Structures are given as structure tokens and as C-alpha cells.
Write a protein that binds this ligand. Structure first.
Ligand SMILES: O[C@@H]1[C@@H](O)[C@H](O[C@@H]2CO[C@@H](O)[C@H](O)[C@H]2O)OC[C@H]1O
Length: 295
């Protein structure tokens, strides 16, 4: 007996991303690196969870045995503990580690070793630390390889983390269609996550129709959720350009109302740039209007 996915999702509520930080090529190379006070402010702001993207590529050896720099693991643990110590449901993953998609067969072992070491190093963390296998799994990889990856990375995790909730891609959506996974691993500690995906990238968001599209997507995902008995998590919503200020505020308010109503847990995307940012890391102030739209 441990905490179950549905209980975890209800607990996660609305949260935030620590974007363009640990998933940049090197911490700091993009947005300001992680500072402990970030978490004090997130807490004071109402966030109930913090997703922490991480790109392991440049901190892991490029050749066998694919060891992760101890120094980097220490760094991620420091940031995780700041989050966990403040009561946040904390999520860590693999983000922008595209090398794995560029050659699945050739790089899957390095990906396993990476996950092997992560699971090991955090095996004793609170139940509130969740393992998200890979940020946006859909794309330049086959549906079979995606399924193979989840099964094997999940199996690695389970050896040292028997009951820790793992997050895997449940599907994605766009203005034309929604895709959901039918092939779900047989595990009692999984949460499904969906992101906006468009296989044909080759307007501006915020309209009426756009909202009708999302409510549609959300209802289908919800049906998926009830049918497969698996909670839902929108790990990075509101990653779009809007026609104007008033439209942006409206979208955050809408999206979060619709998700929380259907019992979905979610994290807003915040790249810390002042440009899809809600929290200013230099002034330690939030875009109050948006924060109120989320809660
Ligand atoms: O500044 C850019 C970031 O905003 C960008 O972050 C992507 C935004 O969409 C989300 O779905 C992705 O997860 C997130 O990585 O990355 C590139 C950077 O230059």
C-alpha cells in the first residue's frame, strides 16, 4: 500500500514549470538558474506542484557506461529537495534529450543507464517526487518504440522504486485531432500526460473556437482517463502566442478551470523570460493577473 495516482493528482492541483533551467544545454545558459527562494515564492503564490525539466545529455558520458556527472546529480538533488521540503509534488524527467529519438536502437541503452542512475539516486525520496520518463515522447519515433521505451524505463525504475508514481505520455492533441494510448503498461502507479502536438508544423490563439476545441479534447481525454482508470496530467499548458494581453489572461483562466473541473492535474509553462513567463526571477514578483486566473 502506497499513495495511488488518483490521490496524487488531486494533491498536485495547479502547479508551475521551472522552465528553461535544468533542461537548457547547461544550467544558466538560458534562463536564470535555480535558486532556493524560487520555491518560497512559488509556495507563497499557491502552486501545489513543480515540474523540473532536465536535459541529461551534457552531464552524462557519451560512451559506455554513460555515467552521469556526480556533480550534476548532486545539483538536481539539491533542487529537488528544495521543492520537496516545501511540500510541492515535484516532477523530474528527461527533457530535450532528443539524441534518443535520432537513433532509438543506438541510444536506448544510454537512456536506460541514465534512468538507472536517476532511479537509484532518488529511490528514497518522498512519494511526492514523481518520475516522468520523457517530456514529449510523440514525434520522430515510432509508436512501437515509444511503447518499448516506457516498458523498459518503467521496469528499470521499479527495481529500486516499487511504488513511486511514474508519468508516461497518454497522448496529445492539436486543433484537428486527439490521440490517446491504448497500450498502457500494467502498473498501479501511473499517471498519463498530454501535451499539444502537431505533426505538421511545416492565426494566434485565444479565440472562441479554440476554447471549444480544448473542451472537446479535455472531454475525450477525460473519457480515456475514466476508461483506463488512469489520472491525467497536463504538464505544460499555455505554450502559445496570444493576440493580446486580455486574451492571454482569459486563456489561463479558461484552461485551468476546465482541467481542474475534470479532475486533471496540471503545471503551467513558465520559461522565466521577460516570452511566456509568469514569475520574474530577478524581481521575485509574479504577473498577479495571471496567478489569479489560475486560482
Ligand atoms: O525559449 C524557448 C522555450 O520556451 C522552449 O520551451 C518549449 C515550449 O513548449 C513546451 O511544450 C516545451 O516543453 C518547452 O521546452 O524551448 C526552447 C527555448 O529556446
Amino acid at each position: 500500500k502506497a499513495v495511488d495516482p488518483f490521490e496524487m493528482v488531486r494533491k498536485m492541483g495547479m502547479g508551475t514549470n521551472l522552465g528553461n533551467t535544468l533542461e537548457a544545454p547547461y544550467e544558466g545558459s538560458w534562463s536564470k538558474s535555480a535558486m532556493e527562494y524560487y520555491f518560497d515564492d512559488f509556495k507563497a503564490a499557491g502552486y501545489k506542484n513543480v515540474r523540473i525539466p532536465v536535459r541529461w545529455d551534457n552531464h552524462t558520458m557519451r560512451t559506455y557506461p554513460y555515467t552521469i556527472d556526480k556533480a550534476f546529480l548532486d545539483r538536481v538533488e539539491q533542487v529537488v529537495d528544495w521543492s520537496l521540503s516545501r511540500g510541492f509534488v515535484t516532477i523530474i524527467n528527461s527533457h530535450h534529450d532528443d539524441w534518443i529519438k535520432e537513433d532509438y536502437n543506438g541510444n536506448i541503452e544510454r537512456f536506460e543507464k541514465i534512468w538507472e542512475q536517476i532511479a537509484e539516486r532518488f529511490k528514497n525520496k518522498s512519494e511526492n517526487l514523481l518520475f516522468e520518463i520523457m517530456n514529449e515522447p510523440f514525434g520522430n519515433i515510432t509508436d512501437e518504440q515509444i511503447d518499448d521505451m516506457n516498458s523498459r524505463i518503467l521496469k528499470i525504475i521499479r527495481k529500486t522504486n516499487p511504488t513511486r508514481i511514474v508519468i508516461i505520455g497518454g497522448g496529445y492533441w492539436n486543433s484537428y485531432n486527439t490521440l490517446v494510448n491504448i497500450k498502457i503498461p500494467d502498473d498501479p502507479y501511473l499517471i498519463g500526460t498530454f501535451h499539444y502536438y502537431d505533426p505538421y508544423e511545416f492565426g494566434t490563439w485565444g479565440t472562441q473556437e479554440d476554447m471549444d476545441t480544448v473542451v472537446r479534447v479535455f472531454d475525450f481525454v477525460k473519457s480515456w482517463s475514466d476508461r483506463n482508470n488512469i489520472p491525467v496530467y497536463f504538464g505544460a499548458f499555455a505554450v502559445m502566442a496570444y493576440a493580446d494581453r486580455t486574451s492571454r489572461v482569459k486563456w489561463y483562466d479558461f484552461i485551468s478551470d476546465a482541467a481542474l473541473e475534470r479532475g486533471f492535474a496540471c503545471s503551467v509553462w513558465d520559461n522565466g523570460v521577460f516570452d511566456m513567463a509568469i514569475y520574474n526571477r530577478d524581481t521575485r514578483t509574479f504577473d498577479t493577473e495571471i496567478l489569479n486566473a489560475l486560482f
